[PDB]
């Protein structure tokens, strides 16, 4: 689990990374070192049982989003991150973990290496991964692969600057399923 939480670089949320963990006792003691700006929220499971229940296969999904977007990483949620980047199912059994990463993932100029999808023709299915860079046609005229009127680049960078308020700072997220 250290190789996921302590990973030097996380993924962009439109291109979220999935690690299968198998035959591991899950030492959650790594999570105590992430206090003081840590959202931990479990669904279908007690957080306390995760230490003892060695699930034969866990998926650890990992990505970066804004602080105000962390609330969209839950079952039944809607919004640009939930609908077009990372959807959980409504019967989701597992755990959402998110911590402030502003010291690692911001720069004074802005860090722009983290992206998100801002437009898609339809919402994602649960755990669907859309990495496509095709021009989003909002209009009734073909884009022909060119950005223009009703013709948008589907991905956008954030901006992660150290001086931004907590809701605009980068949060590293790990979802366990």
């Amino acid at each position: 689990f250290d190789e996921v939480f302590n990973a030097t670089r996380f993924a962009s949320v439109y291109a979220w990374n999935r690690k299968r963990i198998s035959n591991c006792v899950a030492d959650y003691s790594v999570l105590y070192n992430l206090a003081p700006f840590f959202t931990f929220k479990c669904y279908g499971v007690s957080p306390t049982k995760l230490n003892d229940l060695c699930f034969t296969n866990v998926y650890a999904d990992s990505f970066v989003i804004r602080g105000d977007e962390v609330r969209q990483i839950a079952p039944g949620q809607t919004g640009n991150i939930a609908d077009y980047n990372y959807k959980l199912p409504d019967d989701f059994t597992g755990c959402v973990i998110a911590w402030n990463s502003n010291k690692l993932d911001s720069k004074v100029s802005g860090n722009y290496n983290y992206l998100y999808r801002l437009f898609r023709k339809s919402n994602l299915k649960p755990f669907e991964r859309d990495i496509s860079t095709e021009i989003y046609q909002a209009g009734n005229k073909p884009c022909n692969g060119v950005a223009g009127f009703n013709c948008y680049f589907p991905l956008r960078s954030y901006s992660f600057r150290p001086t931004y308020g907590v809701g605009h700072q980068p949060y590293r997220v790990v979802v366990l399923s």
Partner: antibody
Amino acid sequence: EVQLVQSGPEVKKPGTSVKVACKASGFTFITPVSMQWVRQARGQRLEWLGWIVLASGNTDYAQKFQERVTIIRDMSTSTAYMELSRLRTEDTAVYYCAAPSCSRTICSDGFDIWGQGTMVTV
Amino acid sequence: VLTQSPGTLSLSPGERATLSCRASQSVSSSYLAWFQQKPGQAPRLLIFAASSRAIGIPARFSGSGSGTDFTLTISRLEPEDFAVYYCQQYSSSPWTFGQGTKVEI
């Protein structure tokens, strides 16, 4: 209904700046809508100033007024602003905002919703 | 550059107006637009995408043309149609209007 509500009339001196507001209602700024700025001096043609994407925040400007004009948005109040610096007497015009009637995942192919206009006098 | 013709068009109610727009040196005309403007009012869209009618625009209005040459036709003038008409190009930055055509009684 979608509506654009502009700020009231402005009287300025030459060399100063003006900042016209446009508050949009009835649609979310989450949609990739172009809000545009157009002016009309009395009895003159329409002049396009520039635009802003209401979802990404990317702007572009007509080359004649590219250095002075700055278009911005506030996502929290659903308000675009057009700021015009280094004002001249020739900048005396009704400034309009305009936007296409857009939906969650689909836009119209023409710009049909206009604000009522803001008279700027210089 | 868009050039409209005529500059003024005097016509009775019930007559057919026909208004030209010519695109000059450059084209790429794929998002063409057409507007009515009344005194003291903002411009209202009549036709978009060369010929597609705007919502709530009467069936007497029709747009046509491609490449360099475009036309707005009003098949039977009504007293509310006496106004200045403007064409406007797109995907051709700066997004230029024509100079207008005044329709009057």
